[PDB]
Amino acid sequence: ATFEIVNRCSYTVWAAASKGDAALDAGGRQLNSGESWTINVEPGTNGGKIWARTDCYFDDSGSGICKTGDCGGLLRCKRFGRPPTTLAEFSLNQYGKDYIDISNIKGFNVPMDFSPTTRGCRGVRCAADIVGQCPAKLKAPGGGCNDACTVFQTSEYCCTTGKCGPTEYSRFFKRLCPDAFSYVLDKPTTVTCPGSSNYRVTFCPT
Numbered sequence: 001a002t003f004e005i006v007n008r009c010s011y012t013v014w015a016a017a018s019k020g021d022a023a024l025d026a027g028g029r030q031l032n033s034g035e036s037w038t039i040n041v042e043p044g045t046n047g048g049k050i051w052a053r054t055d056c057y058f059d060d061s062g063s064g065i066c067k068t069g070d071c072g073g074l075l076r077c078k079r080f081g082r083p084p085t086t087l088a089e090f091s092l093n094q095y096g097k098d099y100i101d102i103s104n105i106k107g108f109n110v111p112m113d114f115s116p117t118t119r120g121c122r123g124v125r126c127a128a129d130i131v132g133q134c135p136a137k138l139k140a141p142g143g144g145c146n147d148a149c150t151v152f153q154t155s156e157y158c159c160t161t162g163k164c165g166p167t168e169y170s171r172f173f174k175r176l177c178p179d180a181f182s183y184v185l186d187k188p189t190t191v192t193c194p195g196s197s198n199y200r201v202t203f204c205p206t
Contacts, residue, residue: 001040001041001043001045001092001098001196001197001198001199002038002039002040002041002117002198002199003017003038003039003040003041003050003198003199003200003201004036004037004038004117004199004200004201005017005031005036005037005038005039005050005200005201005203006031006035006036006200006201006202006203007031007032007033007034007035007036007052007203007204008033008034008202008203008204008205009033009052009110009203009204010033010204011033011054012030012031012032012033013030013031013052013053013054013110013203014028014029014030014031014052014053014054014056014058014066014069014075015028015029015031015037015050015051015052015053015201015203016028016050016051016052016053016069016071016077016081017039017041017048017049017050017077018048018049018071018077018078018079018080018081019045019046019047019048019049020047020049020079020080021078021079022078023076023077023078024039024041024045024048024050025039025040025041026039026076027074027075027076027077027078028053028071028074028075028076028077029075030056030075031203041090041092043092043093043196044092044093045090045091045092045093046091046092046094047089047091048089048090048091048092049080049087049088049089049090050087050088050090050114050201051069051081051085051086051087051088051109051110052068052069052085052086052109052110052112052203053066053067053068053069053070053071053081053085053109054066054067054068054069054109054110054143054144055067055068055142055143056070056075058075062074062075062076063075066081067142067143068081068082068083068084068085068109068110068140068142068143068144069081069082069083069084069085069109070082083106083107083140083144083146083147083150084106084107084108084109084140084143084144084145084146084147084150085106085107085108085109085144086102086103086104086107086108086109086110086111086112086126086180087102087103087104087105087106088100088101088102088112088114088201089101089102089103090199092195092196093195093196094195096195097192097193097194097195098192098193098194098195098196098197099190099191099192099193100114100116100121100124100190100191100193100199101114101124101180101181101188101189101190101191102114102124102125102126102177102179102180102181102189103180103181104126104130104147104173104177104180104181104182105147105149105181105182105183105184106147106150107138107140107144107145107146107147107150108126108130108131108134108144108145108173108177109131109143109144109145110203110204111125111126111127111128111129111130111203111204111205111206112125112126112127112201112202112203112205113125113127113200113201113202113205114199114200114201114202115199115200115202116193116197116198116199116200117197117198117199117200118193118194118197118198119194120193120194120197121191121192121193121194121197122191123191124179124180124189124191125177125179125205126176126177126179126180127177127204127205127206128176128177129176130145130173130176130177131143131144131145133172133176134172135169135172137151138151138169138172145173147169147173147183148167148169148170157169157170157183158184159183159184159185162185163185164183164184164185165185166182166183166186167183170182170183170186174186
């Protein structure tokens with residue numbers, strides 16, 4: 001499947017793409033404002049994620065640090081990034097269908113649209129100003145708005161027992177971005193697309 005990753009933000013982002021135990025495609029790249037990066041994701045990929053990283057410094061070996069979404073200090077991510085990270089999540093060719101969602105379960109750093117470029121399903125978006133409106137206790141100094149599990153590490157926020165409810169913090173994210181997951185047991189906002197669809201992830205869509 002083809003994903004075009006577009007940075008419409010006014011600032012540089014370092015896109016990342018991983019399935020948690022390996023990079024997808026090159027795994028990461030710098031995107032200046034307006035740039036587009038096209039990646040190929042193997043059919044059958046289960047549990048892939050794309051996200052943006054902000055305020056990164058990398059050396060010539062591709063080693064460094066980012067203030068949001070850092071993936072063990074690498075330009076080319078092999079593992080998932082450190083919160084806060086708005087996530088585009090996908091599983092492809094699962095019994096004939098692709099499944100896509102946006103999640104705020106690991107917080108929010110950059111607004112995002114995640115849409116098919118082929119026919120037969122809808123896109124999803126979280127483009128509200130979550131950072132600006134972030135509750136004081138969830139604000140990340142490096143930038144972004146952490147989820148409550150990351151911050152407080154309780155069974156209730158992290159849904160460790162598999163039983164948890166919405167919280168004051170999850171409802172913040174859900175009010176601003178209803179079409180994104182706000183906590184682990186949120187009513188799913190997954191979109192079902194035809195198997196082998198192609199997609200575009202746009203940072204700062206509005």
